[PDB]
Design a protein around this ligand. Structure first.
Ligand SMILES: CCn1c(=O)c(-c2ccc(-c3cncc(C)n3)cc2Cl)cc2cnc(NCCC3CCN(C)CC3)nc21
Length: 293
């Protein structure tokens, strides 16, 4: 219902008009998902990202409430911090911490990471995923675009628009929600999948970090999932360039058999993560990427 959704958003949000509370607006985005700005918390000096939406033209408002509630109750150092929300008339505002390091996409697209930098990023993501899965949250849309970076090398998952919450009674999902190139084969071949779809996705993201894109990126999306289903574990262009332990880490992420594929908990113990460089090692790639876009 339209009315009920508004009453429910009303209870969630803080009161009043937030344009007093934030000063230096610069639009950095737009679309059906509304408009995104960077701004400064006029009180505390903190730089924030704000999404403004008009509700009279948002299709699936249930997804919006769900996302906010999920951010609120699942805080974690490797998840982009949800700050506050506001509702002025039909205009909903969501305020998030701002991460100046850009997206991983910028990084993989403009720079070449070494194995130690990749291990560090992979470690940080698995920390997020272990926490989420242990709380029965499946992100379902893991990709470099949904990794945000701090200037200090900090690594945070974002965009929980497509996440699933599972339960012991309904602990498996079937909805095809993720971005095609990153989707596990079982999302298309079967109608039952679990949290390990995020691990497959992370594996594809690891491929991004090596080759600069996920496999089949040139192909039409429609055709990607067919290729994913039928090729199974994707091939690297120069596997021999990789360390044996990195290759083994990938094989565990990209295992066709869900049961053999590593869980996050399991993968956090993998020895590949132990060559991780300090997160600050990422700052030169971040700066360079920033300067290239
Ligand atoms: C990519 C823009 N962006 C966001 O959209 C959000 C964000 C996340 C979640 C919600 C949210 C949560 N719960 C519910 C709802 C309904 N929305 C809102 C928002 Cl504003 C946080 C965020 C933090 N830092 C950065 N800076 C790096 C951007 C990079 C720059 C340079 N490059 C080229 C392209 C990326 N961007 C952010």
């Amino acid at each position: 219902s339209d009315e009920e959704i508004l009453e429910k958003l009303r209870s969630i949000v803080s009161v009043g008009d937030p344009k007093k509370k934030y000063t230096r607006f610069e639009k950095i985005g737009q679309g059906a998902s509304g408009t995104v700005y960077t701004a400064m918390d006029v009180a505390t000096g903190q730089e924030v990202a704000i999404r403004q939406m008009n509700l009279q033209q948002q299709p699936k408002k249930e997804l919006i409430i769900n996302e906010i509630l999920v951010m609120r109750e699942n805080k974690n150092p490797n998840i982009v911090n949800y700050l506050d929300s506001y509702l002025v008339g039909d205009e909903l505002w969501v305020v998030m911490e701002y991460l100046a390091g850009g997206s991983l996409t910028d990084v993989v697209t403009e720079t070449c990471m070494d194995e130690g930098q990749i291990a560090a990023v992979c470690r940080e993501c698995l920390q997020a995923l272990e926490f989420l899965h242990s709380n029965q949250v499946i992100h379902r849309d893991i990709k470099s675009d949904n990794i945000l970076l701090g200037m200090d090398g900090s690594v945070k998952l974002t965009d929980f628009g497509f996440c699933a919450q599972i339960t012991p009674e309904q602990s498996k999902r079937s909805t095809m929600v993720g971005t095609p190139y990153w989707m596990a084969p079982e999302v298309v071949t079967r109608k039952a999948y679990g949290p390990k779809v995020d691990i497959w996705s992370l594996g594809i993201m690891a491929i991004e970090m090596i080759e600069g894109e996920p496999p089949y990126l040139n192909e039409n999306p429609l055709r990607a999932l067919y290729l994913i289903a039928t090729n199974g574990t994707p091939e690297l262009q120069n596997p021999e360039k990789l360390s044996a332990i990195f290759r083994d880490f990938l094989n565990r992420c990209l295992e066709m058999d869900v049961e053999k594929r590593g869980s996050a908990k399991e993968l956090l113990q993998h020895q590949f993560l132990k060559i991780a460089k300090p997160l600050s090692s990422l700052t030169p790639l971040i700066a360079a990427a920033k300067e290239a876009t």
